[PDB]
Design a binder for these strands. Sequence first.
DNA 1: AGGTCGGCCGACTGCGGCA
DNA 2: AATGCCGCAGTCGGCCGACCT
DNA 3: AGGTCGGCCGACTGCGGCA
DNA 4: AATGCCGCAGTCGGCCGACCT
Lengths: 262, 253, 262, 253, 49, 49, 49, 49
Amino acid sequence: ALESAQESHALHHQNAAALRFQFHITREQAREIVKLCPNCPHAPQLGVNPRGLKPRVLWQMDVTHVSEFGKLKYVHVTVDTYSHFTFATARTGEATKDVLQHLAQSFAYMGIPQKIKTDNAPAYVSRSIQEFLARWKISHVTGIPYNPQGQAIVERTHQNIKAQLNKLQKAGKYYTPHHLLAHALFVLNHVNMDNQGHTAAERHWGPISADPKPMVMWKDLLTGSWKGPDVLITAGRGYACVFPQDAESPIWVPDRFIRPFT
Amino acid sequence: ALESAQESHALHHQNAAALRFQFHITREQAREIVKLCPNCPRGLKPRVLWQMDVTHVSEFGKLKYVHVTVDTYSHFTFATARTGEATKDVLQHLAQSFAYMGIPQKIKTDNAPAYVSRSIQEFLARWKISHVTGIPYNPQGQAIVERTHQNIKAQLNKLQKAGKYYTPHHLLAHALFVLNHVNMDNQGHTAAERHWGPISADPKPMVMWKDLLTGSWKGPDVLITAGRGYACVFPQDAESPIWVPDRFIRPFT
Amino acid sequence: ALESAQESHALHHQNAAALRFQFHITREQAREIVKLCPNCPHAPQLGVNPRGLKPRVLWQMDVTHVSEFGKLKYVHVTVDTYSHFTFATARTGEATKDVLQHLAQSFAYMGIPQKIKTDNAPAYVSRSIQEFLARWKISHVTGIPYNPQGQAIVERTHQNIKAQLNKLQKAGKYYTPHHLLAHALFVLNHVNMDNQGHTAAERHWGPISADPKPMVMWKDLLTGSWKGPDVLITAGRGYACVFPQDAESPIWVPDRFIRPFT
Amino acid sequence: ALESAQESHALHHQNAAALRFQFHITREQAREIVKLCPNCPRGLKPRVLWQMDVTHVSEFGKLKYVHVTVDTYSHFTFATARTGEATKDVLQHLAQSFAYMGIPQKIKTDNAPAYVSRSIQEFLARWKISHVTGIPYNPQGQAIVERTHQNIKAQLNKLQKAGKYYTPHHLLAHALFVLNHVNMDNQGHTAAERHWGPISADPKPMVMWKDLLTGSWKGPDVLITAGRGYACVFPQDAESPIWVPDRFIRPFT
Amino acid sequence: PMVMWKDLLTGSWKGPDVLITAGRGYACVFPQDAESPIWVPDRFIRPFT
Amino acid sequence: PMVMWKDLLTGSWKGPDVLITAGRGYACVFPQDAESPIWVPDRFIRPFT
Amino acid sequence: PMVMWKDLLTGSWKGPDVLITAGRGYACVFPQDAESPIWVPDRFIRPFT
Amino acid sequence: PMVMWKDLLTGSWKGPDVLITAGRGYACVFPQDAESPIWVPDRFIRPFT
DNA sequence: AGGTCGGCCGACTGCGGCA
DNA sequence: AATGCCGCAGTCGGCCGACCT
DNA sequence: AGGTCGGCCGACTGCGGCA
DNA sequence: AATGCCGCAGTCGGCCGACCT
Ligand SMILES: [Zn+2]
Ligand SMILES: [Zn+2]
Ligand SMILES: [Zn+2]
Ligand SMILES: [Zn+2]
């Protein structure tokens, strides 16, 4: 019986499929046998990095290492998570004042959010940063330490910036590192157009607009059930957002938990 | 509420318009907040003609060469505290103004060598920017830069009561932020907003929102959607859209 | 015109999409503009690691580093590429005699191939190895240097072996490293059953039970055209094999070049 | 062809059956190849009952303790040149025989302590292997191991004309290879083949193959498929299947 | 709470009984049967009806 | 309830351990062996027992 | 050989003319027009007919 | 004909360079700058011009 | 006896990570 | 001179059994 | 005037690699 | 204490224009 299937599994750690044929059991029975194996250690899409619902809501910030410019490698980067509006500052360090330099510039460049998410670096943890945030009234999320995905928007942005800088550097000489960088920033927000025919800058501060959306069934992993159907707010490659009448706050999930309702 | 109006006034020293539009302050009261402060006494399209100028902020003494680019439409001001008046200083500023402002159709500068250089002319050709020589000096162009320089300096003077900056750039950037994103005109718009130009014939409906936590109507706020007897509205300072029983919503006209 | 589109692209490296809207050009025109950018730089499925058509045809061999056993980390591994029949020998080095030891054992364990593929290590390049190949009359492919995919079958096998060794070590104590290893080999070929109800050993020495196959259209990337239709020999996750009457030899390609013919 | 038959005979010294089945040699000629060589004078299912034994190959002197497991069905021989007769040596051998042979239904050993240990009994329980106690001696079981030991040693003796092995294990493994995979019985089958048991009521058709490169009939070879006037056959030593106009194919019965 | 679940080992519906918690598509079922808590895939949950 | 969990920092696989909470992409594990709660993403959590 | 290809820049069919080679789904078109060889995606090739 | 190509060994992107051949998962590049032909996977080849 | 529904099971898929 | 792979364990759709009509 | 076909264009997808 | 992403550049299917019937 299953007892002997388990016995054999414990002994040789036999393949669930093999257990089925050997013991004449179902797949699910075999799966449980191997699932209960403490000696038998798969990671499908599960969580999702949420974002602002309109411009100047949630920003994301981190730094990179553009070794090309020596000390100036410390580029500070901030991105409007709603519009994917980007901004970067080639500083010579990660001092409070370098963070603040970038910030001051980003206030002039981008404007002002309701909240901002950074990593767990001391460059953001410091009381002086918390002071600044208190003065400007901006909420601060640090995310989970050592999990780079908390900064996925700006990291992906870093790929874009890097590539942009490479193309532009190959294109010619620049007076300064900042000349190059500014050229890149210009392109990234005012030249680079999306598949809707709009620019990042345009999205960042464009006219308030919205399209009507269909109802979808929404799976809640904390209940293991499909809820709704209800009108989906938005979506994109791999993700979706919905905010039901009976919900406390907006719901961000992977789009594999969406089932368009007829 | 006005306590925090005063707080942010102490922090940025924004004008009466900005204060009252955000906090619903009697225009008179907003002016009182201002006068009691220790340091607070074109075409049809943006990104077309820009006005260029350079000043000498002695308060810096090294970065005193502040290069300035102003959108003549919106009056948006971009400025870079440079170390000189070289053609490369101009071009560096210009590159930065592209990142912040974009690329215009034409730019008006004076006849200084700092703009004359054929290398700049090349760049203007590259960016299809027509050059206005600046020869026809008049009170219009003069007022643009005069008001600009005074406004910049005014904000910089305001920030001398909170000299907690590491560089002239920290100071200036803060000033410019307030100047283009915080201060409001009589219609509640900012220079950045106008510069950007999203303002047009907006077809979206707005509604008065009975904020049931107060039992009163707020807004009007832009309505996002509706269904099953509730309306989904998303207020200015809200972090998310709010579902409210239709009976507490007033289609605003 | 396109000249100005190219001009602007050269200047700012403008997004093809942006060029479409800015210059009122087609997507493909915009794509060519950016494609011709010497300063601008995607890797879809293209090649495929082919395999034997029946047991004892093509074997694949490489080594790994099971640090658990110190010097014995030098495990030599050979796999029948047709049946995925595996064999491993925990040696204390990569000397001619360690390669040979494994080989001798694999001749007894697996049998004898027509040909065998290894990497470009001196452990296989050596004249003495080439001699063995001459004595045993086996063809030798070394693949492209530094491209691990030439050994993908045994590398994937190494993952399986590693995992098997881990779960078995967790299961208890072993007399020797070889005791553990042999147990793993036992499981891998005689216990672990596939989704057809057959073991690797069974596949290795089983009689050729051939199934009838449908005709498919086959794209040849050297001509840029669909050929056939003709009967597909086999396929698997990501790959397929066909051998037409007018073909010189069997054709191994990715299965995305297959279009089932009605 | 027979030149290479002789070559491989020099290399492995396979029997007359193997020689002639591979090279189509007159049985007499195959025997001639053998006699001219300087060193060449159950149930219905496999993996059921295995015969265990241990010998003393003095030629090694350290690894002389060769543990041997023979499938009584196929007569497949697996052997491990061990350093002793410990219960752990037996179990180590056993583990190796599982990798090469698999797990049987029962194993026959003698009554030595090397098998008696309850730890072994435990392992037999783990693998559901019934133990045949081997208490009485019998010429049948004795012939199994006697023939086995002689055959092993015979091959090992053959390989003394090419003592180019680094270890006893290189030597033995080579010998075992020939013994189970090269030498053929009167039906052309090998011990490994029989051990494995793929031989049954094979429904697949075989055809005579007119190898047009010679203009003669070969095989019969197992037919793989067919279509459009050609047949796809895959011969023993072929690298791949071969398409041949149907008229040059003869369904073999 | 009191929910019923498909016996992952036999297929028979068990309970409804003491569900402790849930998350990521699983339901940690665990009544006084100390032999083992059971994270049951959500698809096999049928709440007391 | 208890779960298995990967050590985000070093990559070492940890657990089984005390499950505190989970949902919406995150989880908390917290043995009294630890000084403070272990805050990790759902992606490294296995439904132990 | 003499094959015709869609002008990747205008859409007009060009040739048939001197194809040099092909591979990876592309056709390196290159007649005496030294301005540039052109690896044309195979889907745009129509051999002399 | 010519192509662009990645340096499999160091990872540095190389080319444009002398195309010799390609097909069935491989390519050959060979400048006279090199001592011998460059035999690489076709996954690293881009259709230069 | 035919229709509706559960479930029982095969088939297919995103994922990671081996070098 | 040749060229990514495949197990894990979820997930979907279909086929069949049981039971309701 | 309706039917057939090319092509012209949007929409969607495997991939890698940022930390 | 919160949670992967998105550009590239191929590839498929559909909509419409032109031209044949
Ligand atoms: Zn197990
Ligand atoms: Zn004031
Ligand atoms: Zn470019
Ligand atoms: Zn001989």
